[PDB]
Amino acid sequence: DDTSSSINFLTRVTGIGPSAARKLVDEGIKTLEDLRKNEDKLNHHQRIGLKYFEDFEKRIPREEMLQMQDIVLNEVKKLDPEYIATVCGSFRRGAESSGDMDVLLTHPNFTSESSKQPKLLHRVVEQLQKVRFITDTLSKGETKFMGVCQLPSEYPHRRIDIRLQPKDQYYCGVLYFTGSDIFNKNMRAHALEKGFTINEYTIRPLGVTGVAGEPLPVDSEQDIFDYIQWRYREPKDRSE
């Protein structure tokens, strides 16, 4: 019990997985105090998770999400109008509150046949840091950024992810990350009944063989619904 309750509290800190949590409790750190007195035992991601432990357990009001959206979309547009940025998650479905901000980013210069273009993403991250919206980085790779942001003022720090997706796979991504999970499940099931398979990257025909063919052209979410003969489903109507 004691061990379990300690392992559960730790897992509430972003970055601290189950294994990492056990190893930590196994070393004598169980409380928030212990953690805060032992940052030297945590990697960068876990340490930032600890720093904003409380803030990260707070919900985000839609009104704030909207202000966050404006900041993101506006800065991106200034860097290059060709950039396309979409805030997904339950927020895109009209949710009155969110737990984090998930942003899908693309640029016509970056397609799936293209090699890595990390600066496409990092340029955006750097600018948002410049305007002081992004305050910390949990981690960042060639196509994904996980960090912390804050509205200027008192405002809680919020979790934000920015994913760079190839232009030719962008809308399948926006669809997937908009959800909900139930809706995605139901849409993929229907796609199958129609001879198509859909994932977060593409929609492909499904030969009677069961083996998916080449990816089909997608230039909007609408195209995906069109392929499977479903009338367009507004994000607000995608609870399931």
Curated annotation (Swiss-Prot):
Highest taxon above the source species: Eukaryota
GO terms (BP aspect): apoptotic process; base-excision repair; base-excision repair, gap-filling; DNA damage response; DNA replication; double-strand break repair via nonhomologous end joining; homeostasis of number of cells; immunoglobulin heavy chain V-D-J recombination
Cofactor: binding comment: Binds 2 magnesium ions per subunit.
Positions bearing Omega-N-methylarginine: R62
Annotated binding of Mg(2+) 1, by residue: D100, D102
Intracellular or extracellular location(s): Nucleus; Cytoplasm
Major localisation: nucleus
GO molecular function, a single term: metal ion binding
PTMs per UniProt: Methylation by PRMT6 stimulates the polymerase activity by enhancing DNA binding and processivity. Monoubiquitinated protein is then the target of STUB1/CHIP, which catalyzes polyubiquitination from monoubiquitin, leading to degradation by the proteasome. USP47 mediates the deubiquitination of monoubiquitinated protein, preventing polyubiquitination by STUB1/CHIP and its subsequent degradation.
A GO term from the CC aspect: microtubule
Cofactor: Mg(2+)
Amino-acid positions noted as binding Na(+) 2 in the UniProt annotation, renumbered to this chain: T11, V13, I16
Residue ranges of the region described as DNA-binding: 93-102
Primary role: Repair polymerase that plays a key role in base-excision repair. During this process, the damaged base is excised by specific DNA glycosylases, the DNA backbone is nicked at the abasic site by an apurinic/apyrimidic (AP) endonuclease, and POLB removes 5'-deoxyribose-phosphate from the preincised AP site acting as a 5'-deoxyribose-phosphate lyase (5'-dRP lyase); through its DNA polymerase activity, it adds one nucleotide to the 3' end of the arising single-nucleotide gap.
Family to which this protein belongs: Belongs to the DNA polymerase type-X family.
Name the UniProt record assigns to this protein: DNA polymerase beta
Portion of the full sequence shown: 91 to 335 of 335
